[PDB]
Design a protein around this nucleic acid. Structure first.
Ligand code: CA
Ligand code: CA
Ligand code: CL
Ligand code: CL
Ligand code: CL
Ligand code: MG
Ligand code: MG
Ligand code: MG
Ligand code: MG
Ligand code: MG
Ligand code: MG
Ligand code: MG
Ligand code: MG
Ligand code: MG
Ligand code: MG
Ligand code: NA
Length: 212
RNA sequence: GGCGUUGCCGGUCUGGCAACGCC
């Protein structure tokens, strides 16, 4: 697979229908096994799926292969996992609601997310039941863990990375100037930047940062 | 088998192994 018949879109892409339907044959198997073993996980990690069956073909074509199958109503895609169309994790109906509400609290809070502490108080939850739900949201890619008390919704993180790219485009920036850019405060921005250092999105040099 | 906790590992976690708890 393949050259550049089942045809793709990425600039076009023949793949011998022969092996396009083998490609989807394996995907159904993997995902059934996975959903079957992990009914409380949102799906197979994307890179696990790729590494497992698609290391062969290049990253931007794999993207399109997922993109098309979702389009055909065959896959449900998340920021960082794939699942089959009608898969539904088996949490209690109370927990399903909690997943919706946790997501919302983090979305609406945006650049000033609550701490885990606050959340557990306000949702009236065991640390342990909260850990299960935060964990699934993290597997799924809906929340991202900045440090032991701050999670960020992925939209909020994505939008703060653009803000940082803008800020850095005029040259190295300080913590205060990043706080200005986000109209936020040092309590939130410091953890954000430390997080972005760790994943190598920014890199810190004295009191200044740049975008790598 | 999952899921949690704790411990241990491998610089690290969208982890791995073991014990324990609940399912
Ligand atoms: Ca899902
Ligand atoms: Ca979700
Ligand atoms: Cl993505
Ligand atoms: Cl992200
Ligand atoms: Cl980027
Ligand atoms: Mg696994
Ligand atoms: Mg933005
Ligand atoms: Mg740092
Ligand atoms: Mg950090
Ligand atoms: Mg497992
Ligand atoms: Mg621990
Ligand atoms: Mg240790
Ligand atoms: Mg040892
Ligand atoms: Mg785990
Ligand atoms: Mg025993
Ligand atoms: Na199970």
């Amino acid at each position: 697979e393949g050259l550049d018949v089942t045809l793709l879109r990425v600039d076009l892409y023949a793949i011998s229908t022969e092996r396009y339907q083998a490609w989807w044959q394996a995907v159904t198997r993997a995902l059934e096994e996975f959903h079957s073993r992990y009914p409380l996980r949102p799906g197979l990690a994307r890179e696990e799926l790729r590494s497992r069956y698609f290391s062969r073909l290049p990253a931007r074509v794999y993207q399109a292969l997922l993109e098309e199958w979702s389009r055909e109503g065959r896959l449900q895609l998340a920021a960082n996992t794939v699942a089959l169309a009608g898969f539904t994790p088996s949490f209690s109906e109370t927990q399903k609601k909690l997943l919706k509400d946790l997501e919302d609290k983090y979305r609406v809070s945006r650049w000033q997310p609550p701490w885990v502490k606050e959340v557990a108080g306000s949702f009236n939850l065991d640390p342990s039941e909260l850990e299960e739900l935060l964990h699934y949201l993290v597997r799924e890619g809906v929340l991202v863990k900045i440090n032991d008390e701050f999670y960020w919704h992925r939209q909020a993180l994505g939008e703060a990375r653009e803000v940082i790219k803008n800020l850095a485009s005029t040259g190295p920036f300080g913590l205060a100037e990043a706080r200005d850019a986000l109209g936020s405060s040092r309590k939130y921005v410091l953890p954000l930047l430390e997080y972005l250092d760790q994943v190598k999105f920014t890199r810190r040099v004295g009191d200044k940062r740049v975008v790598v």
